Write an enzyme that holds these catalytic residues in place. Structure first.
Site, PDB file in Angstrom:
ATOM      1  N   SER A  91       0.897  -1.274   0.246  1.00  0.00           N
ATOM      2  CA  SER A  91      -0.078   0.017   0.096  1.00  0.00           C
ATOM      3  C   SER A  91       0.991   1.295  -0.090  1.00  0.00           C
ATOM      4  O   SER A  91       1.672   1.515  -0.938  1.00  0.00           O
ATOM      5  CB  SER A  91      -1.024   0.166   1.242  1.00  0.00           C
ATOM      6  OG  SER A  91      -1.905   1.116   1.257  1.00  0.00           O
ATOM      7  N   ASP A 190     -10.039  -5.006  -4.066  1.00  0.00           N
ATOM      8  CA  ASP A 190      -9.471  -4.307  -3.004  1.00  0.00           C
ATOM      9  C   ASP A 190     -10.726  -3.589  -2.476  1.00  0.00           C
ATOM     10  O   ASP A 190     -11.333  -2.725  -3.343  1.00  0.00           O
ATOM     11  CB  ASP A 190      -8.312  -3.361  -3.677  1.00  0.00           C
ATOM     12  CG  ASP A 190      -7.558  -2.615  -2.437  1.00  0.00           C
ATOM     13  OD1 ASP A 190      -8.015  -1.877  -1.702  1.00  0.00           O
ATOM     14  OD2 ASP A 190      -6.110  -2.991  -2.651  1.00  0.00           O
ATOM     15  N   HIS A 220      -7.290  -5.706   0.560  1.00  0.00           N
ATOM     16  CA  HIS A 220      -6.075  -4.902   0.463  1.00  0.00           C
ATOM     17  C   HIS A 220      -4.820  -5.203   1.082  1.00  0.00           C
ATOM     18  O   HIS A 220      -3.808  -5.383   0.468  1.00  0.00           O
ATOM     19  CB  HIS A 220      -6.505  -3.583   0.929  1.00  0.00           C
ATOM     20  CG  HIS A 220      -5.606  -2.226   0.929  1.00  0.00           C
ATOM     21  ND1 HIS A 220      -5.183  -1.937  -0.381  1.00  0.00           N
ATOM     22  CD2 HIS A 220      -4.907  -1.571   1.684  1.00  0.00           C
ATOM     23  CE1 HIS A 220      -4.454  -0.938  -0.210  1.00  0.00           C
ATOM     24  NE2 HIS A 220      -4.063  -1.006   1.090  1.00  0.00           N
TER      25      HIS A 220
END
Length: 245
Positions: A91, A190, A220
């Protein structure tokens, strides 16, 4: 819950820098590190300032301090004598990975569910509160005690959210400077970011070597989900595809 600490798995010459996500910590990339280590890769994972400690501290830090931690992480390996360094991030870590990609010599880049689209500060903050809530519950605090602490928490504005939006935009704007071999990893559905960011990265970097893999049954935080094992293998095969020495 083991106290969040930076880790350094020393092995062979090939080094990999592992960066966690916003609100996360080195545990989010620990299983990946152990696997790579078992394959002969030396891995190091720092913890961002304001992370791996009670939630309150988070509000007092932004990308500027986190970027310093990222560079210190890179330097941590450079100082150890390691010359070839690949980077893999989750991320936010994936955004810092790409940035490192055009800031210093990187052997390879793995971006895992990195955002290229920005979310409203309201949304981002919702995730922050939800993070604090869960962190409080994990502390063994009674429900009632939690709800009280959470009240004082909202009492402190988080200026950091805006700098995070800017960081994302800036990096996306410099994707054309990335030439290092890149592996784009993305959870198809996601729940925290627009999965299309994967296409942004892949299509806008200038790397002559690049690949993209979509994980259909992941969320995610893909490093901790059910496709983790395959994810480990795919990253390993990518790293192995690089020149190194």
């Amino acid at each position: 819950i083991v106290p969040p600490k930076p880790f350094f798995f020393e092995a062979g010459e090939r080094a990999v820098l592992l960066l966690h996500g916003f609100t996360g910590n080195s545990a989010d990339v620990r299983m990946l590190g152990r696997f790579l280590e078992s394959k002969g890769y030396t891995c190091h994972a720092p913890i961002y300032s304001g992370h791996g400690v009670p939630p309150e501290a988070l509000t007092r830090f932004g990308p500027e301090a986190w970027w310093q931690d990222v560079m210190n992480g890179y330097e941590f390996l450079k100082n150890k004598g390691y010359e070839k360094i690949a980077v893999a991030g989750l991320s936010l870590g994936g955004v810092f990975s790409l940035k490192l990609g055009y800031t210093v010599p990187i052997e390879g880049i793995v971006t895992m569910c990195a955002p290229m689209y920005i979310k409203s500060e309201e949304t981002m903050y919702e995730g922050v509160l939800e993070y604090a809530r869960e962190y409080k519950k994990r502390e063994g605090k009674s429900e009632e005690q939690i709800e009280q602490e959470m009240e004082k928490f909202k009492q402190t504005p988080m200026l950091t959210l805006k700098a995070l939006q800017e960081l994302i935009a800036d990096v996306r704007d410099h994707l054309d400077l990335i030439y290092a071999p890149t592996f784009v990893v993305q959870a198809r559905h996601d729940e925290m970011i627009n999965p299309d960011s994967a296409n942004i990265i892949y299509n806008e970097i200038e790397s002559p070597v690049k690949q993209i893999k979509w994980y259909e049954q992941s969320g995610h935080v893909i490093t901790l989900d059910q496709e983790k094992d395959q994810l480990h293998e795919d990253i390993y095969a990518f790293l192995e595809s690089l020149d190194w020495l």
